[PDB]
Design a protein around this nucleic acid. Structure first.
Ligand SMILES: [Mg+2]
Ligand SMILES: [Mg+2]
Ligand SMILES: [Mg+2]
Ligand SMILES: [Mg+2]
Ligand SMILES: [Mg+2]
Ligand SMILES: [Mg+2]
Ligand SMILES: [Mg+2]
Ligand SMILES: [Mg+2]
Ligand SMILES: [Mg+2]
Ligand SMILES: [Mg+2]
Ligand SMILES: [Mg+2]
Ligand SMILES: [Mg+2]
Ligand SMILES: [Mg+2]
Ligand SMILES: [Mg+2]
Ligand SMILES: [Mg+2]
Ligand SMILES: [Mg+2]
Ligand SMILES: [Mg+2]
Ligand SMILES: [Mg+2]
Ligand SMILES: [Mg+2]
Ligand SMILES: [Mg+2]
Ligand SMILES: [Mg+2]
Ligand SMILES: [Mg+2]
Ligand SMILES: [Mg+2]
Ligand SMILES: [Mg+2]
Ligand SMILES: [Mg+2]
Ligand SMILES: [Mg+2]
Ligand SMILES: [Mg+2]
Ligand SMILES: [Mg+2]
Ligand SMILES: [Mg+2]
Ligand SMILES: [Mg+2]
Ligand SMILES: [Mg+2]
Ligand SMILES: [Mg+2]
Ligand SMILES: [Mg+2]
Ligand SMILES: [Mg+2]
Ligand SMILES: [Mg+2]
Ligand SMILES: [Mg+2]
Ligand SMILES: [Mg+2]
Ligand SMILES: [Mg+2]
Ligand SMILES: [Mg+2]
Ligand SMILES: [Mg+2]
Ligand SMILES: [Mg+2]
Ligand SMILES: [Mg+2]
Ligand SMILES: [Mg+2]
Ligand SMILES: [Mg+2]
Ligand SMILES: [Mg+2]
Ligand SMILES: [Mg+2]
Ligand SMILES: [Mg+2]
Ligand SMILES: [Mg+2]
Ligand SMILES: [Mg+2]
Ligand SMILES: [Mg+2]
Ligand SMILES: [Mg+2]
Ligand SMILES: [Mg+2]
Ligand SMILES: [Mg+2]
Ligand SMILES: [Mg+2]
Ligand SMILES: [Mg+2]
Ligand SMILES: [Mg+2]
Ligand SMILES: [Mg+2]
Ligand SMILES: [Mg+2]
Ligand SMILES: [Mg+2]
Ligand SMILES: [Mg+2]
Ligand SMILES: [Mg+2]
Ligand SMILES: [Mg+2]
Ligand SMILES: [Mg+2]
Ligand SMILES: [Mg+2]
Lengths: 263, 158, 134
RNA sequence: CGACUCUUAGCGGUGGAUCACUCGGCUCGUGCGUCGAUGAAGAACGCAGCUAGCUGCGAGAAUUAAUGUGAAUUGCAGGACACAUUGAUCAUCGACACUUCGAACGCACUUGCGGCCCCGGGUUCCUCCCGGGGCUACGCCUGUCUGAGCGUCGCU
RNA sequence: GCCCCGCGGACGCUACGCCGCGACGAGUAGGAGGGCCGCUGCGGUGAGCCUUGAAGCCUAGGGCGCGGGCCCGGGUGGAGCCGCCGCAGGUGCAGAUCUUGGUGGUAGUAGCAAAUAUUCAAACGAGAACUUUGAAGGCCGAAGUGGAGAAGGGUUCCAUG
RNA sequence: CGACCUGGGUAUAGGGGCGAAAGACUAAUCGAACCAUCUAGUAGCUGGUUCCCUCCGAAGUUUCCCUCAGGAUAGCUGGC
RNA sequence: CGGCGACGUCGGCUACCCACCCGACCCGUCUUGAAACACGGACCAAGGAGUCUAACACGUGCGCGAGUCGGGGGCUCGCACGAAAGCCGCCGUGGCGCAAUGAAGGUGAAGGCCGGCGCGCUCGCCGGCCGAGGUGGGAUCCCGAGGCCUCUCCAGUCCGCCGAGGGCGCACCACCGGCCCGUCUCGCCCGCCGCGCCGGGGAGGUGGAGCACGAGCGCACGUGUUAGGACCCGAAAGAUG
RNA sequence: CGCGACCUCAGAUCAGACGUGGCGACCCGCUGAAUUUAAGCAUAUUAGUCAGCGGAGGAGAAGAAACUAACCAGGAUUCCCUCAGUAACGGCGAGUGAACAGGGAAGAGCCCAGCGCCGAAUCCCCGCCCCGCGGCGGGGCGCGGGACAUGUGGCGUACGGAAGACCCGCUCCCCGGCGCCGCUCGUGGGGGGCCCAAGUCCUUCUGAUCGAGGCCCAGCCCGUGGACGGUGUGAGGCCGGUAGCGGCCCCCGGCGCGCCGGGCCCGGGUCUUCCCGGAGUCGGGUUGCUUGGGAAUGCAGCCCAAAGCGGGUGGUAAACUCCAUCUAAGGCUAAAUACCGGCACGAGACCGAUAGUCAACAAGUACCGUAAGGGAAAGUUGAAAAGAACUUUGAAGAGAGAGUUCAAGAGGGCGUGAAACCGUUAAGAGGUAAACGGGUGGGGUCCGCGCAGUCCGCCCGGAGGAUUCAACCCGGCGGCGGG
């Protein structure tokens, strides 16, 4: 709020012999404002309690290793099929969910051939879901320039732009990403992992040099290697029905012993 | 009042600080502004090397940092003399004289003269009248090797 | 998506400029689409309305095929009055009902030197755009 | 059975909460970064066919010219406007114009009182009156003219 | 003799879930936990809802929840709104001789009591205790309730409606 | 008929004026005017301090303090 | 097992009104004590009070780890989002941590065993290995005498369970030794380019926020203190014009 | 007993110019409190801050060492990170508190006086005509005036400089327009104007539709345009716009060479001979303010008052002696940095009419005060005025009909229309003021479309129909297994 809001008044606190509360009252005598309470957070026309400042520490810094961690996690979750489905992305006729294409599509120029490519690649049901998801916001965002809201669609992760952004950029929901500069705010839109992604062959080959395998480090990040697992086999059912654990267990107690009635 | 156990602190907040609070919301805007100023300056001096003159090698002046070396303000008049060039044509060429630096060591003197001679061998000099090359260079190098150098002219390493 | 940083997308700014726009800008606002035969004879999709051109209504209560001549362009109220687009108030007299130029369609142009010139400019610009996007 | 009082419900008042809206703010960012004796900021008083405020303007007064634009403005009226023997409106604005105060400038703040030089009328050069026009503030700089000094000197 | 005339055999285990057993339950100041309690906005998600009627408001209607609260029906209204996962607050009122706005009882009450005084008739007019005209009775009683000015006011002056 | 009353014009301005002196008067304000700002001045003092369940649950005592309507400290409490 | 069920009755404790019995003083507040002859409150709507920044502290979560952190700067199409994001590494400067102690000149954290020899003098000479000492507790783990069986016996084949005792002992606690710096007391050696008013060392006590095979750094959240208007409202005053 | 010359002054409505005042967000020079904190309070703190006064600019100030340092040294100013809440100051209490080095942003250096040489080489003003005008100069001419030796210009400034020889190199500058470039870089360089894709297709909803279905071939159409706003609701395709090294037309700019127009003329190394600096200032004493600056950090007043192998600094006062470092007392200077004023824009996890600016509106307005100054309240008919003709009662306000509209249960302070409070209707009740908690009972309003009351798995019997059940054969696909 403005730093002068509620304070350009010259009000005085009117003593205590008069039978009114000791709030500062507007000094004067010719208008409605005269003798009304001022300066207070409870007064009409005063200043708010603890007026908000601009030096509010709006920004937050995150460790680079954790941002890279979040990127790798969102990429893995994009690879997993149940998690992309669970974001609700309508992937049922897509073959081979890590979806990689040629570089003629990086050389594309028109929205017609981009839409045709998505129809041939069976992402058009996700685009149609975005179209069906378009509607108005609820509340003050409409007055504050956010009228229309809609779902998120797939990402296209390219290596070179030879017109691919402009070939896209008009289909709603489609986010272009440029694999070298990867954004967690667009790979995990709500803080939830699992967004549908379509890769180019050049970007999909560059990934293994951008983040490295485990046998070698990354060649474009200098000091970065992938984080290690705390659990190499995350299959509880397999580990518990494995015969070694079963041999080491004891017998289960499946007889429920309810309370007896004391005769 | 002190609660139980803690530091004795002395916050310097007794002096009406929140009129002279300075915020940094214009930091990305001024980074953009400096970037485009550098771009404009480079394409203004398009063949000249985009960052300034060559700087000398300079020993940092304290027992904490006197093992390291860094770029200095400018070359001195003695080592310009041993390099054999005049202290005005040096600044027209791009050498950054600094007259107030002395030399108390022939080793640093010879290092900077060798650096200066290396730059002078590396320098491509355009003629004044392009139809009339008086003493500048040959049109062969003038055509093929007229490229702008980005970053500092030959950098200072330890 | 808009990309030009000097043109705004602020709803309040756009509404304010639309509502207190001056009169020639108001004319440019109150442009209207041409019929298909007119577009074919020319090559122009829309046109700023004029005092004495025939027109027909495609939306609202007075929708129909009656080719009425425009009789008034009330740019102050962003509306037009046509010949037979009328209603009879309580007195028995008749008043013109004003409707929107984006809700009419022009069927015959009041043609003169300036309107031939601006139809030529619009058609020429669409032709240069087509030959560029050949 | 009334009346009166109390409660609840329907309807109707009083009142303007709530919700929805927003040509307004606030905050951040960007580019420019320009007032005045050639009269500024501010003030006053006027100006529209009907007009008090707000807005615009200055006795050319809700504006002239010019240039773009191209048929309206509009609450009512009016008569214009061939759109080529030249154009309504709006925008731009580079031409012209710009009352009285105000640093405010003849003196003074009363619409008080002057002075000098020209022009026209009464004259029928001779200046008396009337009207008009141009000057008439302070400080300061360079140059000019007119001077002052038992200031320092030269020729008698 | 590796089952079988048969080919078959309830529910469960959001593991942050489900089930069992035992003991216990006061509470200011204060502390802590949970909240599928509530408010406003943001990122996501509901191929969510809505002019075949959204928000808001009213309700002798039907219910749920220990509760905070919530859902449904009916009416009114006439354009937007909510559920879930996260995020962020100018986020929950009975008090402050609180602030602003509104409305009561008091109450058709106190009051409309300083300076002697009015009355009859007519006119105009829809309408007369109060206007105008006439008649009467009175008062100010020239240090005036008279006739003119200065300050101050600014059109109050005068006709008509 | 007088140290008389009174209009207008002038002069004196806030720790200042002016006072036949009462701390009177100085624009309904005077034992220090009014107006704005410093300023949301400070307050160990008064008042208020807004949703629900669940669990635990006090102290008014020790020592020091220009301390006795306050704090620090130790106890008593809760949480991890 | 019985009875009764459409234009009259059945159910609806929850909801409206009323009746009766029992119980029941008006809330908020300060207070040892409030229904108080204590103060505030006629009524209703809306607004209305622990916030934000900085700095510490501890707890918790996350990443990396003897390191950690780009926060300032720079490099990347033309800047919807994007004022975001990504990257730098001869951008790690720097901060904090990795070493303490002393007022300061300054100094500055490993022992035991085995052999020989002086004088194996409370101790040097060399050599050899081992590697932060010892005691008492100590979660966990290891060995384990002996047991427990099968239609049944004779000679062993396999693993399973209980197990007295024993062993290595995490973290941590208690103690005892040791090592570093300051400072005392006592005493004798050694070194040299400078033989000095030089330098170094030993034993025994004491002062230290020390060491004794690191735990920190960054980010986030909570709670508590503090300085800021600082939970909200409130002086009598003081100052400048 | 004059006439000149100079000096020092004066006057002028003399010829031509210049200053004043405003704004003040940032900047510079002064002046400069007290609230507050110290749990009192006086030094300290607040604070060199508010208030006050002066002066500017698009920035300003500062700035090319009388510097840092003590190193193997760095090298103008400004700003950022760090140094660092540290050295230090401080009733050593509360509190206060920098610098250097290092890493970056930016980067640029220069000019006098003096000392000296050159016949004052210099500068201003006025006429003549020539070449120009459009922020007004070029040169020529004048036996034209003045400034100026009480010192103008050229060389030249601490990094040294000047003059003679000797050698070497002949090497090439600035300003004004013509013409067309470069077509003038983020692609136009800037300003202005005018334009540029695709549904109002078919059927339906509605008061109106921008709603809802459909539109052969993968399909309504465009998409480098699916931002936004308007339009009787929610619109990529109705309109304006949006995207695009998209188009066209005017005006202005920095720009390369062929000229012409004018000036402008020698640089570097070797030796020799010379020349070299800012005074009531530094510094000292004292006093006051200031600083972290502590036996003086800075500034100022008064007194004393320099030197020339000197002077200053070398964070403890002083003497002696080494060394380091700079050269004061003259001047200019971009960039990086600041910006709550202004002009013009863009955005927002912000507020939504008691909020947000005091001000969404005829708001610094109405109104108050002698004045300084104080200072509000106040948004919403409807899609469109279609804003209710006409009849009738009343003097009228006000009604009753009629009419518009989707709606007047929208009628010019008119969206929604809460609560307090009131009127009326209905129902119930009423001498311990009302109201309340438990427990029943009675009445009433609504609900159960309450009112013959289940459902469904197995098999038994009856009467119907109809494929076909099992089993094989063929084809396909899954699951499991394969040395
Ligand atoms: Mg406010
Ligand atoms: Mg809402
Ligand atoms: Mg009502
Ligand atoms: Mg004109
Ligand atoms: Mg007078
Ligand atoms: Mg004389
Ligand atoms: Mg309890
Ligand atoms: Mg409803
Ligand atoms: Mg609040
Ligand atoms: Mg309340
Ligand atoms: Mg309360
Ligand atoms: Mg009465
Ligand atoms: Mg009475
Ligand atoms: Mg009488
Ligand atoms: Mg009189
Ligand atoms: Mg006073
Ligand atoms: Mg007395
Ligand atoms: Mg008085
Ligand atoms: Mg008194
Ligand atoms: Mg109390
Ligand atoms: Mg008390
Ligand atoms: Mg008591
Ligand atoms: Mg009580
Ligand atoms: Mg009592
Ligand atoms: Mg009390
Ligand atoms: Mg009371
Ligand atoms: Mg009250
Ligand atoms: Mg409230
Ligand atoms: Mg970044
Ligand atoms: Mg480090
Ligand atoms: Mg380092
Ligand atoms: Mg042990
Ligand atoms: Mg020990
Ligand atoms: Mg604490
Ligand atoms: Mg307060
Ligand atoms: Mg606080
Ligand atoms: Mg106060
Ligand atoms: Mg005082
Ligand atoms: Mg003159
Ligand atoms: Mg105090
Ligand atoms: Mg106190
Ligand atoms: Mg005191
Ligand atoms: Mg000031
Ligand atoms: Mg000025
Ligand atoms: Mg300057
Ligand atoms: Mg300067
Ligand atoms: Mg530190
Ligand atoms: Mg200070
Ligand atoms: Mg740089
Ligand atoms: Mg000279
Ligand atoms: Mg110098
Ligand atoms: Mg279009
Ligand atoms: Mg719309
Ligand atoms: Mg649209
Ligand atoms: Mg465009
Ligand atoms: Mg010393
Ligand atoms: Mg409202
Ligand atoms: Mg307001
Ligand atoms: Mg207000
Ligand atoms: Mg205002
Ligand atoms: Mg309605
Ligand atoms: Mg309505
Ligand atoms: Mg209404
Ligand atoms: Mg009622």
């Amino acid at each position: 709020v403005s730093e002068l809001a509620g304070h350009q008044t010259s009000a005085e606190s009117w003593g205590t012999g008069r039978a009114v509360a000791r709030i500062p009252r507007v000094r004067g005598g010719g208008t409605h404002r005269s003798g009304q309470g001022a300066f207070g957070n409870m007064c009409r026309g005063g200043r708010m309690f603890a007026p908000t400042k601009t030096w509010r520490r709006w920004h937050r810094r995150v460790n680079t290793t954790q941002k890279r961690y979040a990127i790798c996690s969102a990429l893995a979750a994009s690879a997993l099929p149940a998690l992309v489905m669970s974001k609700g992305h309508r992937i049922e006729e897509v073959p081979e969910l890590p979806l990689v294409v040629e570089d003629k599509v990086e050389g594309y120029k028109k929205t017609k051939e981009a839409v045709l490519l998505l129809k041939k690649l069976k992402a058009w049901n996700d685009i149609k879901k975005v179209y069906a998801s378009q509607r108005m916001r609820a509340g003050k965002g409409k007055m504050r320039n956010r009228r229309r809201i809609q779902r998120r669609g797939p990402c296209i992760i390219y290596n070179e732009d030879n017109g691919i952004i402009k070939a896209f950029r008009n289909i709603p929901g489609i986010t272009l990403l440029n694999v070298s500069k990867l954004n967690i705010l667009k790979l995990a839109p709500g803080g939830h992992v699992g967004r549908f992604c379509i890769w180019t062959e050049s970007a999909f080959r560059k990934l293994d040099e951008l983040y490295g395998t485990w046998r070698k480090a990354a060649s474009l990040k200098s000091n970065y290697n992938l984080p290690m697992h705390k659990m190499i086999n995350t299959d509880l059912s397999r580990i518990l029905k494995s015969p070694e654990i079963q041999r080491a267990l004891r017998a289960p107690r499946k007889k429920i012993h309810r309370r007896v009635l004391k005769k | 009042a002190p609660s139980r156990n803690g530091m004795v602190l002395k916050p310097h907040f007794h002096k009406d600080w929140q009129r002279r609070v300075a915020t940094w919301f214009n930091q990305p805007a001024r980074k953009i502004r400096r970037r485009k100023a550098r771009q404009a300056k480079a394409r203004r001096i398009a063949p000249r090397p985009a960052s300034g003159p060559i700087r000398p090698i300079v020993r940092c002046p304290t027992v904490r940092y006197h093992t390291k070396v860094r770029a200095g303000r400018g070359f001195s008049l003695e080592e310009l003399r041993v390099a054999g060039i005049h202290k005005k044509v040096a600044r027209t060429i791009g050498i950054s004289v600094d007259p107030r630096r002395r030399n108390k060591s022939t080793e640093s003197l010879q290092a900077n003269v060798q650096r200066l001679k290396e730059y002078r061998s590396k320098l491509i000099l355009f003629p004044r009248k392009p139809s009339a090359p008086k003493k500048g260079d040959s049109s062969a190098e003038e055509l093929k090797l007229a490229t702008q150098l980005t970053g500092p002219v030959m950098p200072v390493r330890n | 998506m808009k990309f030009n940083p000097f043109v705004t997308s602020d709803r309040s700014k756009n509404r304010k400029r639309h509502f207190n726009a001056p009169s020639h800008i108001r004319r440019k606002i109150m442009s209207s689409p041409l019929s298909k035969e007119l577009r074919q004879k020319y090559n122009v999709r829309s046109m700023p309305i004029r005092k004495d051109d025939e027109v027909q209504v495609v939306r609202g209560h007075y929708k129909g095929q009656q080719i009425g001549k425009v009789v008034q362009v009330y740019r102050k109220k962003y509306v037009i009055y046509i010949e037979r687009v009328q209603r009879e108030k309580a007195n028995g007299t008749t008043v013109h009902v004003g409707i929107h130029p984006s809700k009419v369609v022009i069927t015959r142009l009041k043609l003169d030197k300036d309107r031939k010139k601006i139809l030529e400019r619009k058609a020429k610009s669409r032709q240069v755009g087509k030959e560029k996007g050949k």
